[PDB]
Design a protein around this ligand. Structure first.
Ligand SMILES: CCOc1ccc2cc(-c3nn(C(C)C)c4ncnc(N)c34)ccc2c1
Length: 452
């Protein structure tokens, strides 16, 4: 059983935990699916293979409406291919930030689904460990949509990368016992409690300028309902949170018992009989929170893609150089395709043609391969550049066009860019920056922060 015999790649869905997720189509039935591809080289394995294979076969037999459905598993010399159901509703928080109203009832409905999925996985002795908002996908982009939890089972068998672009935003949700090494299924209740806290206040209970500051707060395990917006929240909501954020895991409430809590029972009634004050301050805070996380994430991805495109620019140039036996710097369509594939080994027809459209619209003859390389690599970094700009614009909620030094400090702290380093970089871009930057200056900073 070879993966490529059955599935063809259609389009990339993203780079989630442990590797790329590619939208694929069954070659016979047309069935679309989301395949997580884990590189055995890039990602280390924790357990023996037998244990991994058994857990995988178990997961194929489990079905729950709030857990991502796993269909199939493949393996070759380099990779694992995990074939899951594709969900098109995006990440929960990216929906939440577009809503005009949000109440305790909305929060309770969300958390009841998460707790239902978790309870079922815990019954089968499967622990997530890395539960966070990113792992809550929607079937459709609407507040009416079901939540599907992704990544159950992976933490037990795969080591997470320490690359900051991957470990960004993780510190808020991780249980203290996970930091110290002894953990069980209760760690998922803790992570869910942090998410619930954020839904109801828009602020993480354990917050900080950078990873270590956040982790230090999580380890001490102390948090409060001191913020003004907690006055708008029921005592019942707060009581559940206290049980879910109980430090010693044996004293911490179970996912199953959390489903039986008064708050869940009361606020998830299909008929909203209780007061429904919109948590307006929480929505504004959550928008700020999401915006900050997505911008820091986009910033790191942009720098990563800039480095990647630097390499591939040199490699592709060398590839074409070898093919340039004439030494005239010009190649035809055929040769450009071969070289583009030669780099890929280190759809293709159509991508080349998009480049040739800009270079030689008429296509009357040969193409300066140097001209080609630029446009080829330039447009390949488009997604990251456009996503960076979109994230900047979304973070800039008042449409000021600027981000302040306080905001830069938050964004770079989350990104693990050193305070003195980015300040120095700012000074070089704009000596009279006046404690704020526009998008262009922000982008210039990112470029200097990755050796450009
Ligand atoms: C034993 C677990 O095996 C799997 C198999 C498939 C998976 C697909 C996704 C997924 N990511 N994304 C984007 C956010 C990058 C998705 N988008 C839509 N649907 C999806 N299903 C995913 C995540 C985890 C998965 C784990």
């Amino acid at each position: 059983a070879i993966f490529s015999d059955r599935y063809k790649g259609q389009r990339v869905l993203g780079k989630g935990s442990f590797g790329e997720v590619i939208l694929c189509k069954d070659k016979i039935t047309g069935q679309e699916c989301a395949v997580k591809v884990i590189s055995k080289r890039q990602v280390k394995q924790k357990t023996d293979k037998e244990s991994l294979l058994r857990e995988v076969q178990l997961l194929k037999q489990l079905d729950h409406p709030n857990i991502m459905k796993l269909y199939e598993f493949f393996e070759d010399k380099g990779y694992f291919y995990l074939v899951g159901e594709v969900y098109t509703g995006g990440e929960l928080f990216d929906e939440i930030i577009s809503r005009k109203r949000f109440s305790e009832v909305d929060a309770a409905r969300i958390i009841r689904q998460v707790l239902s999925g978790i309870t079922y996985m815990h019954k089968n002795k499967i622990v997530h460990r890395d539960l966070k908002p990113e792992n809550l996908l929607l079937e459709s982009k609407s507040k009416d949509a079901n939540i599907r939890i992704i990544d159950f089972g992976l933490s037990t068998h795969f080591e997470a990368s320490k690359k900051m672009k991957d470990k960004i935003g993780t510190a808020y949700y991780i249980a203290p016992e996970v930091l110290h090494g002894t953990y069980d299924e209760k760690c998922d209740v803790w992570s869910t409690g942090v998410i619930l806290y954020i839904l109801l206040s828009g602020c993480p209970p354990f917050n900080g300028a950078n990873e270590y500051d956040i982790l230090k707060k999580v380890e001490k395990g102390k948090y409060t309902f001191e913020l003004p917006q907690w006055k708008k929240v029921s005592e019942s909501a707060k009581d559940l949170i206290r049980k879910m954020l109980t430090y010693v895991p044996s004293m911490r409430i179970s996912a199953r018992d959390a489903l039986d809590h008064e708050w869940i029972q009361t606020y998830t009634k299909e008929q909203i009989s209780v007061d429904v004050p919109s948590l307006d301050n929480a929505i504004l805070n959550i928008r700020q929170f999401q915006g900050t996380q997505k911008l820091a994430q986009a910033a790191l991805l942009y720098m990563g893609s800039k480095l990647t495109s630097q390499d591939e620019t040199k490699e592709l140039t060398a590839i074409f150089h070898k093919m340039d036996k004439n030494g005239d710097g010009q190649l035809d369509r055929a040769e450009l395709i071969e070289g583009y594939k030669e780099l890929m080994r280190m759809a293709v027809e159509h991508e080349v043609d998009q480049v040739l459209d800009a270079v030689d619209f008429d296509k009357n003859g040969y193409i300066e391969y140097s001209e080609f390389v630029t446009v080829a690599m330039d447009r390949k970094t488009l997604l990251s550049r456009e996503r960076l700009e979109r994230a900047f614009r979304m973070f800039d909620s008042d449409n000021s066009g600027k981000i302040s030094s306080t905001e830069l400090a938050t964004i770079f702290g989350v990104s693990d860019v050193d305070s003195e380093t980015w300040k120095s970089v700012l000074s070089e871009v704009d000596k009279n920056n006046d404690g704020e930057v526009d998008f262009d200056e922000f982008q210039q900073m990112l470029l200097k922060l990755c050796g450009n």
